Amino acid sequence: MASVTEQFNDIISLYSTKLEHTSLRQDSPEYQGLLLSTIKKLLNLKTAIFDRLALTIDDVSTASIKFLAVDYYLGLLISRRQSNDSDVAQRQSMKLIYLKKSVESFINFLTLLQDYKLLDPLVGEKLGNFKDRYNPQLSELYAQPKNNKDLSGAQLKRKEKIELFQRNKEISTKLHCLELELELLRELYLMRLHHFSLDTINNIEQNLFECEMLSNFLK
Amino acid sequence: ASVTEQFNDIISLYSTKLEHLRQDSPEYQGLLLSTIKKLLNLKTAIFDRLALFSTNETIDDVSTASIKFLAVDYYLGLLISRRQSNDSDVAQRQSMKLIYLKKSVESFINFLTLLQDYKLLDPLVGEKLGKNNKDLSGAQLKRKEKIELFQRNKEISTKLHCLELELKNNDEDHDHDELLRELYLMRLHHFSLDTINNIEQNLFECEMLSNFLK
Ligand SMILES: [Zn+2]
Ligand SMILES: [Zn+2]
Ligand SMILES: [Zn+2]
Ligand SMILES: [Zn+2]
C-alpha cells in the first residue's frame, strides 16, 4: 500500500529524526508511543511488500532494493522498546523479549542478504558461526578469551574487532561519498545495504551482551 | 582457636566450597554468611585487638606468616560479592544485591588502601584506586576486552608460577624464607589486580541495578 516506497521513506525519517536519538525520556509514553506505532507500520509494510506483493539481485528493480532493509529497521526499532508495567519482573523480562526480537530481525536481514548473494564474507562468516540461528551466542560471533589471563584469546578478539571496524569504516566512507555525489542510485542503495550489514554485527553484539547482563539480574 | 588457624580455615572454606554449585540456595548463602561473620571477627582481632598493621609501620616489620593477613579485606570483598537475597520479590533481591555490591567494593578498596599504606600498591592499580543500561553495557563490553588487563594477569601468573617452583626447587636445603616472602607479596600483587577487576565489575553491576530505579 500507498505507495510502499512513501510508507518506507516516512518510517525511515521517523527513525532518523525522532527515534534513533531522543531528547525525551526513553521510558516516556511519548517516545514508546511513536516507537510502537512505527514498528506496527513497518510490520504492516513487510507484509505488504514480502507477503502480498511477494517481492538474484539482478531481478530487483532499483527502488525495490531499499526494502531488503525492512528487517534491519525492525532490528533497530525493536531494540529500543521498553515496558512501563508497574511489575518490575515483567518490565525487565519484556526487555529481554525485545532484545531477542531485535536480534531475530537483525538475523532475518542478514539471512535475506545472503539469500540474494549480497552478504560481505566478513559478515557471512559470523552469520554462519551460529549453530542455532534462532539462539545465537555472543561466543559464536567472535573468539572470546578463555579466562582473565588469556592474552592470545584477547589479542585474537581485538584482531577480529579491528577487522570489523576497518571494514565498517571503509563501507561507511564509500556510502558517504555516494550520498554526496547524489545510474548512481542503484549503487547507493546497494552500498547502503552493505553498510547496514556491517552495522548489524555491532547491534547484534550489543544486544546479546546487554541481554545476558540484564538477564543475570533476574536470575 | 588462634588468629592464624581461624584464617587458614576461612580461606580453605572459601577456596573449596564458596569460590565456585547452587548460589541461591539457603545452604550456600547460609555458609557464605557464617564465613563472612567469622572473617569480620578475625578482622577485629588482628586489626583492632592486635592492631597488627597500625603498630607495624613498615612491611618488613610484618612477619612472613602474617603477610597473609593483608588479604583479609580482599576475601571479605570476594565473599560479600557472592551474597544474594532469595526473597520472592524481584525488586527486594535486586536492591539487596545493590547493597552487597556496594559493601564488597568498600572492602576491596579497604584492601588496596592497606596495600597502599605499606607502599606495596602497583602504580597502575594505584591510579585506578585514586548513563543508561545500553551505554553501560556498551562501555563494559569494551573495557572487558582491553588488552592491558590480560597482559598484566599473564605476567603475574607466570611470576607466581616461577616463584612457587623456585621455592620448591631445593636439593641444597637452603633457607627459602626470602623466596616464601616474595611469593606471598607477589600473591597480594595478584590479588590487587583481581581487586581492580572485581571493583569495576561490581561498580558496573551496581550502576545497572541503580538504573532500574532511576
Ligand atoms: Zn567523499
Ligand atoms: Zn537475549
Ligand atoms: Zn622461571
Ligand atoms: Zn552503584
Domain borders along chain A are 2-219
Tell me how far apart the alpha carbons of residues A32 and A128 are, in angstroms, rounded to a whole number: 34
B149 contact residues in A (CB cutoff 8 A): 148, 154
How far, in Å, from the CA of B210 to the mean position of ligand 4?
A: 6
Q: Which residue of A has its CA nearest to B132?
A: A26
Name the DSSP letter for residue A16: I
Closest CA relative to residue A192, chosen from B65, A184, B30: A184
Q: Is B158 on the interface with A (CB under 8 A)?
A: no
HSE at residue B44, side-chain half, CA atoms within 13 A, is 6
Please report which residue ranges of A116-183 form alpha helices under DSSP H. 121-128, 138-141, 151-181
Residue A27: other Cβ atoms inside 10 A: 12
Cα–Cα distances (Å) from A61 to A4, A55, B13, B53, in that order, read: 14, 10, 69, 78
Q: How far is B7 from chain A (nearest CA, A)?
A: 27
Tell me how far apart the alpha carbons of residues A47 and A114 are, in angstroms, rounded to a whole number: 20
Q: CATH number of the domain at A2-219, out of 3.40.1380.10, 1.25.40.540, 1.10.287.80, 3.30.70.20?
A: 1.25.40.540
For chains A and B, CB pairs below 8 A equal 60
Tell me how far apart the alpha carbons of residues A116 and A67 are, in angstroms, rounded to a whole number: 13
What is the stated resolution of the deposited model, in angstroms?
1.8
The cell for A63 is: 527502488
Tell me how far apart the alpha carbons of residues B35 and B38 are, in angstroms, rounded to a whole number: 5
Cα–Cα distances (Å) from A195 to A69, A120, A202, B98, B164, in that order, read: 11, 10, 11, 40, 53
What is the H or E stretch that residue B96 is in? helix B90-117
Instruction: List the single residue in B94, B150, B205 with the smallest CB-CB distance to A148.
Output: B150
Tell me how far apart the alpha carbons of residues A127 and A129 are, in angstroms, rounded to a whole number: 6
Q: Which residue of A has its CA nearest to B209?
A: A217
How far, in Å, from the CA of B161 to the mean position of ligand 3?
A: 7
Q: Topology of B1-214 in CATH?
A: 1.25.40
Cα–Cα distances (Å) from B26 to B31, B86, B203, in that order, read: 8, 8, 26
Residues contacting residue A63 through CB under 8 Å, at least 6 positions apart: A5
